[PDB]
Structure formats: structure tokens, C-alpha cells
Design a protein around this nucleic acid. Structure first.
Ligand code: MG
Ligand code: MG
Ligand code: MG
Ligand code: MG
Ligand code: MG
Ligand code: MG
Ligand code: MG
Ligand code: MG
Ligand code: MG
Ligand code: MG
Ligand code: MG
Ligand code: MG
Ligand code: MG
Ligand code: MG
Ligand code: MG
Ligand code: MG
Ligand code: MG
Ligand code: MG
Ligand code: MG
Ligand code: MG
Ligand code: MG
Ligand code: MG
Ligand code: MG
Ligand code: MG
Ligand code: MG
Ligand code: MG
Ligand code: MG
Ligand code: MG
Ligand code: MG
Ligand code: MG
Ligand code: MG
Ligand code: MG
Ligand code: MG
Ligand code: MG
Ligand code: MG
Ligand code: MG
Ligand code: MG
Ligand code: MG
Lengths: 55, 212, 116, 23, 111, 122
RNA sequence: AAAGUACCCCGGGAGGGGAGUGAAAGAGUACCUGAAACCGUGCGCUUACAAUCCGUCAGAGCCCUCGACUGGGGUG
RNA sequence: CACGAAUGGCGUAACGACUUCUCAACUGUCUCAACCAUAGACUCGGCGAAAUUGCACUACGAGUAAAGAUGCUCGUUACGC
RNA sequence: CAGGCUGAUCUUCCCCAAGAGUCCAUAUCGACGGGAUGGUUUGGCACCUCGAUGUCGGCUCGUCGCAUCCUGGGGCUGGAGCAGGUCCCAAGGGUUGGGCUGUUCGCCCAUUAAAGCGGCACGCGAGCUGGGUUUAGAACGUCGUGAGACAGUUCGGUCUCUAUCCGCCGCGCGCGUCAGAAGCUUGAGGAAACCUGUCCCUAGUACGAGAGGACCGGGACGGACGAACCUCUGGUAUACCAGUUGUCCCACCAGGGGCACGGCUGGAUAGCCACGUUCGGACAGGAUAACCGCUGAAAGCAUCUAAGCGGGAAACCUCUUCCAAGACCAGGCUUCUCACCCUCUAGGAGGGAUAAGGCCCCCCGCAGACCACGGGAUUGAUAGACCAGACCUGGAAGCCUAGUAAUAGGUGCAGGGAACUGGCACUAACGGCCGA
């Protein structure tokens, strides 16, 4: 099964627009005289000190 | 034409008056409050809306809560209608009438509607009861496959309602007839003969059979 | 515990039982470990059902912990330290924390640790 | 057959004057 | 266990305690057009399937040079009474090796 | 579940010895005989002295089958033996006696002469 | 003509932004001029009940523009 | 129709991954399918091809036509991706 | 090879009746001759394709036509009855499994209510097989001086492709339905389904010389097919229990573990399943077919028709089950928010912040490709753990007694254990983006 036609300039774009990224949607943590912000799944680990925000 | 919402409580077996085994699907139709009575003047049909199952007040949505507040009723899990024939049958319901499973009377027949078990994208063999191709004598990679789906240059297309492959179950279905073995008044359970659609603990609408 | 519904992590049934043994025996040594989040969730009901054998003190239970784990320093300190510590607590000896995504594969990490 | 008959009865349309270019 | 609240009426307590391996002498009510009768089945108990009314047990006669194997519900109305006459120990839940054996080799040994 | 082809060793005497199933009667595309259901048969093994030859097409009723069936009150029977009895045009067996336990479903089917014969009904 | 960007900042580097050098980095060693296919960003007008060799002719509305106090563009 | 005697005729124990027919044993080959595991498929992160291509905002029916039409006629049908 | 035209030949009806049917052409056959339909056979023609339209039969999947094989409704009969014949109407459903052959076709076998005929590239190889045909090897008969040849036989002989577009089967995202939301619905328009047997009574009555033997209407039990479900029976089981072989390891003995197809073997709850157990095909009503009619003219009589009024079949409507307001005529019945603020070239404008609610995250499922759908989120039983049961396996470890030992018995319905059931917050369910 080979493509019979060259796909049009309109049709190639309209599919290609669906390929995106979403995310994160941050929340305001606090740590060590500073806020930063973080994803909500990591909100426990941020203040408890399993992750590092310098990276 | 009487009716009742309930749940599927799972199956057992119970022995007959004449010593046979009848397999019985246990449903518990709890105390249902009629909330709203649809009437032929305003709506253009006759129906009864039934409320079922205990829910916490804080879980209830404010649009939904105000409808139960209009009825004068504590809010419930599920709500649904019994469509009924003619105008005359809605004459004997009042909003806040709490009907129970005692009504059905031993040796009745029912419809017992309920949503089916989802089987989760089954193709061809499971879904439609096709035969596959042979397991041996040459057969290259076709052992459960649909085969042909159409003729040739005429018509030059597949017809609508061709039987292929897709998501199976969660259909509304119906059993039809299905004899009521025993109404238990205390506890609020009906022993109905044979299988009734759906998972254990799914919503189920038992009503008296139109064919009977 | 409950069997895995899906394909067995490791890519085999025999590898899964060896993997959960190596994850459990590491957890009771250090008291903390970091894995992929699916490996962390699979480890919880495995690890707690060794700690229940610990707190119930008998030779019978020393044999049945030794059917897994396979290490004498760990099965010692499982019964010496960890067992009589969680004699007080009824259940739930373990927690999970989220440690953000791994670099190469974007696999979501998780730390799994004793409650203390 | 049906297609053979019908083509040759397009001869009699009024615009054609009782002859139509068959083939 | 859900559906305990419906089982209670059908659960007979006339059944004596037996296990698989035991020779058990089951009398059965046969209703036919002529008259009600007490036929009696006589053999070794093969298995028990558990769980309230739904449990069954399977008895094996060996009659006239052929094996017959007959299951009953334990709490059947039709089962009349069960006489357990020889108790025997078999080291096994379910005795499906007796199907192949025939002969005197199928003899179970008493406790 | 006797099916097509297959091999039943006969309960009744008659010198048949063994028979192979041609057809299960009583419907189109009817797959399975068991106990009460009749079949068309063909004699394979046979005996030198008898009133049936080898390879002659005859009716037969099933009497024992190795698959189990429900009956009623959840009470199953199961034999070690797929067996049958060769019958006359209607119902009487041409074999004058019958060996082994027939099913008690036979009485319902009306083969009252077969259940009148034989060591027991079960 | 190397006068090939001393020095400062971002950065692990590459690469850049100031600063300089030059007539000109709109000549930075990826270096004269730098077309098209193709690849984006911003700004107008249009488009989610419509069967479109994708144009053509008639043409509503909208958005810019010139000139007196209506002529042209883009869209359709 | 149209075997035939060293382009040998007729046999022949033993041999044959040769061709042919039958038999017992056993079997998912089948009646009639069912379930489990692994490897792809599928989802997320990374890197990243290929044949092919006159165009595109590419329905269907009965027709017509270089005598089998996504594009022509007349209907019917179809929210965008 | 397939399509196109043609229709000699084939194929299905038809005109005229010489006749045969005791007599009587038309109950049923119908010569000779004549007229057409169909495109399904063998052909004629050479119009599309040779910078490729790839191949008979079978399998898988079908879809339409009626010139009906069965079931259903009728007229005539050289129709007593049973069972036929023949013609008209009717396409809803159903039209079996084997033997021989590559076969299609055909002959046979046992059944069946019946084993229908055709079209769709003699439907269907980017769906499958490769037995047939049709490459290269080789032998046999034949023709040829020979190389070799033969719709003459014979044995062997590579079946390529990751789906762009329409199409079809499922599932979301985005705007729309004149404010924004939520719950329950109406049914325009669709789809799936629609089969039929035996036997007992009515009745050995009608009918017939007897032999045979009913319509009409009752009742029981079926087969094939479809859909639900897992109580039973049955299968499966890759973190369940016990047995056991070989070999390495835990210092070693005892007791366990790794590996050998899950090493093999005996069972196995939940889940998914059929071989399992339940249920279905309706019962009515309406307008009709062929056909039977009533009242009646034109045409004093007659006539089912010209006006009018009826009976009448599994077809056609409605009834039964399922989807469904993207049904642009975008519906209905309710309930819930209902309110602010700024800027400007100030008007169906642009924001900002919200309310009723939604979504993301989080804890999961009997829902699941992903998404979605359904629950739960501390006022919490959603999942794990723990505690209890159910159920599955079958009598653990240690010590003790017996045995010279393999092993046996008592502590003990023991020990172990997943999905099913309740109880119990012990662990994990901790803050952002949309929205009048
Ligand atoms: Mg198969
Ligand atoms: Mg294969
Ligand atoms: Mg599993
Ligand atoms: Mg292994
Ligand atoms: Mg013609
Ligand atoms: Mg340059
Ligand atoms: Mg058009
Ligand atoms: Mg010579
Ligand atoms: Mg010679
Ligand atoms: Mg010669
Ligand atoms: Mg020779
Ligand atoms: Mg010879
Ligand atoms: Mg050799
Ligand atoms: Mg997947
Ligand atoms: Mg990828
Ligand atoms: Mg066309
Ligand atoms: Mg056009
Ligand atoms: Mg041709
Ligand atoms: Mg062509
Ligand atoms: Mg030509
Ligand atoms: Mg070409
Ligand atoms: Mg007709
Ligand atoms: Mg073909
Ligand atoms: Mg092929
Ligand atoms: Mg094809
Ligand atoms: Mg071949
Ligand atoms: Mg010669
Ligand atoms: Mg070969
Ligand atoms: Mg595609
Ligand atoms: Mg493919
Ligand atoms: Mg008589
Ligand atoms: Mg169960
Ligand atoms: Mg060693
Ligand atoms: Mg040892
Ligand atoms: Mg090893
Ligand atoms: Mg087994
Ligand atoms: Mg099971
Ligand atoms: Mg939710």
C-alpha cells in the first residue's frame, strides 16, 4: 500500500496540527525562603526534599 | 404495567415446589420514591420518574438538588422513567409515594432491562460469531481474520452495516419474560429466574412484561 | 498478593519474582529506594506481607521469609529491628513519593520508604 | 438488451430529427 | 459472603459430616408415573465443590462391569438421607485417578 | 455427545460387537445424540454367528454416554462407556437382552421395553 | 589592508547580546552579489449544513489607499 | 486410438527425506472454538527512514462517455479535524 | 481472461391447435409452423487495457433479483379421503453432513419441512490456500531424418507490498443549537430480528366397498439459529496449595531456594468462556396481493365495477428490541446560578476577575488501544495493608512416640494462599487552568 497522490498543502497541515504538547500546569510550593513552582504530583516531594529545583 | 428500579445482587440456585432446581438471579429493588409525574397536558406523554439509592447531600449538584427539593424528597443516586401506555395509569401515583418490591406477586413475568458487560474491542470472532480460516494446510496469517469485505469494481465500495470489528458491550439490551420465582417482602429482594444483564451491582429496571 | 493483570514487569514471570526479591531486600537494608513508579506500586503488597511475617515471631515465619529474600543480614534485621518496631502499627508500613521523570526514557520515578 | 435498445431510441428527441450518431 | 441472607431456608442440617475417600450410601427419591420410590446409590465419594447450596458431591458405584459416576447437590430436597458406612483416608482432595483404574486397584483403605 | 463417525460398543447382545454412527436423527444439522436420542449406525466389528452381518445400516438408541448431562434437580449421571442398543423399525430391540445400566432418561423417551430389560435403570 | 572582534555579560560548551575594527559586518573565516522550490513568525479578510480540474464572470460585506470636499488595491 | 525383447521384455529378496492406496495407535486437522504467557502492534520520552506523487476542500445511486466515473448529467446524501 | 455490442445457438414464456386423453384440443400433454423476452452456455465482432486489467476450484465474508426448493394465501382438476398435478400471488426467514474426483457439473450414501435457480471482473488472492492450468528437470505412448512437438498422460516445481485518498467498523477532540449550566426525556429518521418439526386430543369421527384417513381449532416436548449470563456441569489458569526427577547454592544435618517448556505431574477460587442454564421468534390492529364477494348500471335482462361498500397471506405499515435533536425545522419538561471591574479609535468590541458547574492532577474499576465512560477524594471505605470469614489445597515447621531403617502416628480439619465478603483511616487520595 503506497500513497497514490502527493498529499496537498492544506491536508498535510491539518493532521500535523494535532501533534502537540500540553502541560504542565504548575502549583505554588514553598521551600527555604523562596517559592518556585512545581507540578502537583511532585508537590509532596518538593517541600519534603526528594527533588532539587536547581536543574 | 408496574415497574421498579433495582440492582443486580448476583446469582444462586433455589429448589422448586416440585423439587427441580431453578437458577435464580437475585435483585434487590429498594424503596423507590416517585419524584416527578410526566403528564399528557404539558409534556405530550405519560410517564413516571423513579428515584433510587442513597447518596450524601454534599455529593449532589445544585441543579439536581433543587429538583428533589421541588418533590419534597431526600436526593438519590439514580433516577429514570417508566413510560406507560394511555393516560390512565399515572392517575394512581403521587409525588413522594415510596413504592417497594412487594407489588410483583409470585409467578409474574418481567422485562428486566440493564446495561451489558463491556468486552473491550473484540473483533470478528467474538463480536459477530464469524468462522476463522483453517489453522493448517498452508494458511498464512489468517487464522482469526475477517476475509473478504466486498465484491469488486461494481459496486467498488463496502456497504453500510458490514460486520467488522469494534467496541463490544455496554449495550442496553433486554431479557424479556423471565419468570419471577419468589418476591421476598422483607429485605426487599426478588428472585428472578435466569440471567439478567450487567455486572454485579449495576442499575436494573424491572417492569411487567409487554408480551407476557 | 494480587497477580499483575498486564504483562509482567521484567518481561517474564520468573524475572518478576526475582526482581521483587531484589527490590525488597534492598528496601529493608537502606530503608529507602527509588524505582520506576510501576515497580514501586508492585513492591508495596510484596513488602508489607514480609513485615507481617516479621512481627509475628516464630521459627515457622523465619522459614517462610527465607523462601524469598535469600540473604542473612536482611532476614536478621527484618526480625531484629523492623519486626518488633511495627508490632505497634496494624498495617500500612510503607509510603510512596513522586520523584519526577527519568532523563533518557521519561519513565516516572518514585521513592518507596518505611513510615517510621 | 436494455442499454442497446435505449441508445437507439434517443434518435426520436425532436432535436435529433430521427437520427443520432450511433457510435 | 453476599447472598447468605437468602440461603438459610434451603440449607438442611440433616447431612452427616463426610469427606472425599469415604464410602457413602445415598438413598434417592425417584418420582415416576407409577409410584414414588426410594432407589439407593452406593459407592465412594470422589469430591466436594463448596459454597452453600451450590456445593455438590460425586459418588462412584462400578456396576456390572462398567463405572457409573453420579453427582448430587448436598442440600437437595430429593436426597432423603445419607448413610456414611465406611470412612477412609485418601491423601487427596479430588480422586480422579479412580476413573482409569478399574479392578481391585481402585479399593480405598479405611482409617 | 455421539456426533458423526464415532464408535459405540453395543450393550445388547445380537452379535453386533461395535457400531459406527452415520446420522443423528430428529432434525436437520442435528449434532449430538445422548442417551434418549436415536441414531443411524453401521456395524464394524460383528460376530461370525448372528442375525446381523458386518457393514449393514441399522438404527440404534444410545444408553450410556461418557459425557454427563443435567437431567433435573442438578443431578448428573456419567458413565465410563459410550454404548447403544440396535432397535427394530419402531422401538423393540432386535437383541433379546441388554447388558449394563441404561439411563433413567429412557423411560421418558418411551423405550419401555428396553428399561423393562437390563440389570438396572439409573 | 587581518585591521580575524582586546574587554564585559548569558551559558558546561557551541552560539549569541553589548563594545569595538572598517567605506560597509546590510563583508565575521558557516565570509562578494544571494534567485526559486521548500520552512517559519506577525498583521488584514475569509472559513466548522457543505459535494469544490480548484478557475472564470456577476457580486454583498469588511479592511487599507488617492483625489475633489469617487478612482484604484487586498479579501470573496 | 498408439506394449514388446540390450532407445532391452517379464520378474525380483534388500534398499528409498521418491509416487500411490489402505490400516491400527494418537491427536485442536476438524465438529467449534476457548483461555494463558512472551515478542511486535497500542500509549509516553528519544532518534528517525522508504517505495510513491499531474493536481485536491477527493461521497453515493441511476446514467452518459474510449462501451466499468471521487471530477461530466440529474437526483439523493453528508457539521470541522 | 474480464467488460461492450449482437443474440445464430442456448434459456424462460407465448400465438395457432393436427391430436393423444373411453367420448371430450385446452384436468394434463401438445406435433408441424409462427412471435418475442433474458444475456446465464457455445459463438460472432475487435471498441477500452500488452511503459502488466495477475491466474480455474475451494475457504472466509457476503449483497441483490425472482423465473419459489420449503413454510404462507388462492383458482381449476379426469380433486371421495390421504397424497398429488397444474396455474396465479408472494422474496420475511430458512435452504444439512459425508463418499469418489483438482474439479465446476455429476453419480451415490444417510437424512430433511426443504436440500431452489441466477447476477455481482463466470463477486471476493494489496483477504487466504495452490490441488488444476501454464516456465525451466524427467520418463511413457505418438509424429519428426533431426533439433524437437502434442487442450495426449505422468511425478516434481519461490504466491511480493509498513494503507495517502474515498469506502466501511469502532472512539475522541473543536465550534454550533441567541446567556451560561445540570437532570430526566420526545422520536423525524434508521438498524437488528422474522425458521420450522414431530407427537397426543378433537376422531378411527367426516369421507370410502374396504384398504386407508382428514380440514378447522386445541395442548405438550423439540431441532437449527440469535442474545444475555456464570448458579450448576465443563475448559483455561505464568505472584495459589501439595507431590516428584536431575543438578548447583544457603557452612553442614533438617528445612527451603534457583534452573531445566510454567522442569514435569495431581487438583485449582475469581476473571474470560461453551460443551453450561435462562430467554427470544409473538399476540393484536390497519391498508393490500392473487382470489372470493354484496348491491348494481351503461345494455328491460345480466355482471365483483362503471359510483359506493366489504373479506383476504410469513410480504407492506404498526406492535416487540436497540441507536437517535449535527433532526440546521439543531426539539420538550424542569431545576440552578443571575454579577461585577477597567480600558478605548465607545460597540452584536477588547480584556480582568468570577458564580452555577466542568476539566487537569490524585486514589482506582467487572470501563478501557489511547481517549472516553463510571466511582472515590479526609464530613473519606476508592485501592493497598491488617483483622476476620468464604473458598482452594490436604495434614506445615518444630518437638515427641514407634521402626535397625525407607517411612508411619500424635500435637491439629493443621499450615499456606490471589481476585469473592464485611469490618478497620494504619499508608496513599496533597493546588492550578477554564467558565454568564
Ligand atoms: Mg477454527
Ligand atoms: Mg502461522
Ligand atoms: Mg491473570
Ligand atoms: Mg523457570
Ligand atoms: Mg435480446
Ligand atoms: Mg554573502
Ligand atoms: Mg451536484
Ligand atoms: Mg532383437
Ligand atoms: Mg532396440
Ligand atoms: Mg518404445
Ligand atoms: Mg530398464
Ligand atoms: Mg514390469
Ligand atoms: Mg540414496
Ligand atoms: Mg496495549
Ligand atoms: Mg515515538
Ligand atoms: Mg457510476
Ligand atoms: Mg467540478
Ligand atoms: Mg472477450
Ligand atoms: Mg475493463
Ligand atoms: Mg481494439
Ligand atoms: Mg500504468
Ligand atoms: Mg412470482
Ligand atoms: Mg471470479
Ligand atoms: Mg496469492
Ligand atoms: Mg482484490
Ligand atoms: Mg500444482
Ligand atoms: Mg523415430
Ligand atoms: Mg519434493
Ligand atoms: Mg488512513
Ligand atoms: Mg494490512
Ligand atoms: Mg381402522
Ligand atoms: Mg462463582
Ligand atoms: Mg555448599
Ligand atoms: Mg538435606
Ligand atoms: Mg542458577
Ligand atoms: Mg491440571
Ligand atoms: Mg473457573
Ligand atoms: Mg471524575
Amino acid at each position: 500500500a503506497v500513497p497514490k497522490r502527493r498529499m496537498s498543502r492544506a491536508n498535510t497541515r491539518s493532521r500535523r496540527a494535532q501533534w502537540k504538547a500540553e502541560a504542565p500546569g504548575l502549583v505554588t510550593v514553598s521551600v527555604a525562603g523562596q517559592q518556585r513552582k512545581v507540578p502537583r504530583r511532585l508537590l509532596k516531594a518538593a517541600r519534603l526534599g526528594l527533588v532539587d529545583l536547581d536543574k | 404495567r408496574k415497574g421498579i428500579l433495582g440492582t443486580k445482587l448476583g446469582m444462586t440456585q433455589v429448589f422448586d415446589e416440585n423439587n427441580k432446581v431453578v437458577p435464580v438471579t437475585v435483585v434487590k429493588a429498594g424503596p423507590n420514591v416517585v419524584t416527578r409525574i410526566r403528564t399528557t397536558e404539558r409534556d405530550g406523554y405519560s410517564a413516571v420518574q423513579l428515584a433510587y439509592g442513597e447518596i450524601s447531600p454534599r455529593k449532589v449538584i445544585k441543579p439536581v438538588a433543587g429538583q428533589f427539593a421541588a418533590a419534597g424528597v431526600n436526593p438519590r443516586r439514580h433516577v429514570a422513567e417508566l413510560r406507560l401506555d394511555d393516560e390512565a395509569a399515572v392517575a394512581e401515583y403521587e409525588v413522594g409515594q415510596e413504592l417497594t418490591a412487594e407489588i410483583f406477586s409470585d409467578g409474574a413475568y418481567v422485562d428486566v432491562t440493564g446495561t451489558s458487560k463491556g468486552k473491550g474491542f473484540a473483533g470478528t470472532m467474538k463480536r459477530h460469531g464469524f468462522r476463522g480460516q483453517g489453522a493448517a494446510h498452508g494458511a498464512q496469517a489468517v487464522h482469526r481474520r475477517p476475509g473478504s469485505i466486498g465484491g469488486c469494481a461494481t459496486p467498488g465500495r463496502v456497504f453500510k452495516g458490514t460486520r467488522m470489528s469494534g467496541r463490544m458491550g455496554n449495550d442496553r439490551v433486554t431479557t424479556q419474560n423471565l419468570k419471577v420465582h419468589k418476591v421476598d417482602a422483607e429485605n426487599g429482594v426478588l428472585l428472578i429466574k435466569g440471567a439478567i444483564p450487567g455486572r454485579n451491582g449495576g442499575l436494573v429496571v424491572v417492569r411487567s412484561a409487554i408480551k407476557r | 498478593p494480587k497477580p499483575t493483570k498486564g504483562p509482567r514487569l521484567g518481561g517474564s514471570s520468573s524475572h518478576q519474582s526475582a526482581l521483587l526479591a531484589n527490590l525488597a531486600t534492598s528496601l529493608f537494608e537502606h530503608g529507602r529506594i527509588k524505582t520506576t513508579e510501576p515497580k514501586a506500586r508492585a513492591l508495596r503488597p510484596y513488602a508489607e506481607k514480609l513485615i507481617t511475617h516479621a512481627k509475628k515471631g516464630a521459627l515457622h515465619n523465619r522459614r517462610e521469609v527465607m523462601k524469598k529474600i535469600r540473604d542473612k543480614d536482611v532476614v536478621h534485621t527484618l526480625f531484629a529491628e523492623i519486626g518488633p518496631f511495627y508490632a505497634d502499627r496494624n498495617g500500612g508500613y510503607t509510603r510512596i513519593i513522586k520523584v519526577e521523570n527519568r532523563k533518557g526514557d521519561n519513565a516516572p520515578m518514585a521513592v518507596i520508604e518505611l513510615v517510621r | 438488451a436494455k442499454r442497446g435498445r435505449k441508445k437507439r431510441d434517443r434518435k426520436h428527441s425532436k432535436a435529433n430529427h430521427g437520427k443520432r450518431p450511433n457510435a | 459472603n453476599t447472598l447468605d441472607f437468602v440461603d438459610q431456608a434451603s440449607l438442611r442440617d440433616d447431612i452427616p459430616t463426610f469427606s472425599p475417600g469415604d464410602t457413602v450410601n445415598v438413598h434417592v427419591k425417584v418420582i415416576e408415573g407409577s409410584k414414588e420410590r426410594i432407589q439407593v446409590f452406593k459407592g465412594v465419594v470422589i469430591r466436594r465443590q463448596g459454597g452453600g447450596i451450590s456445593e455438590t458431591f460425586t459418588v462412584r458405584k462400578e456396576s456390572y462391569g462398567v463405572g457409573v459416576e453420579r453427582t448430587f447437590p448436598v442440600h437437595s430436597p430429593n436426597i432423603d438421607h445419607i448413610d456414611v458406612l465406611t470412612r477412609g483416608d485418601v491423601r487427596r482432595a479430588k480422586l480422579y485417578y479412580l476413573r482409569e483404574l478399574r479392578g481391585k486397584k481402585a479399593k480405598i483403605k479405611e482409617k | 455427545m455421539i456426533q458423526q463417525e464415532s464408535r459405540l460398543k453395543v450393550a445388547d447382545n445380537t452379535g453386533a460387537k461395535e457400531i459406527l454412527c452415520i446420522r443423528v436423527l430428529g432434525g436437520s444439522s442435528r449434532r449430538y445424540a445422548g442417551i434418549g436420542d436415536v441414531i443411524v449406525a453401521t456395524v464394524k466389528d460383528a460376530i461370525p454367528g448372528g442375525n446381523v452381518k458386518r457393514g449393514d445400516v441399522v438404527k440404534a438408541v444410545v444408553v450410556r454416554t461418557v459425557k454427563e448431562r443435567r437431567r433435573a434437580d442438578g443431578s448428573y449421571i456419567k458413565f465410563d462407556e459410550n454404548a447403544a442398543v440396535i432397535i427394530k423399525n419402531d422401538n423393540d430391540p432386535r437383541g433379546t437382552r441388554i447388558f449394563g445400566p441404561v439411563g433413567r432418561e429412557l423411560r421418558e423417551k418411551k423405550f419401555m421395553k428396553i428399561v423393562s430389560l437390563a440389570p438396572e435403570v439409573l
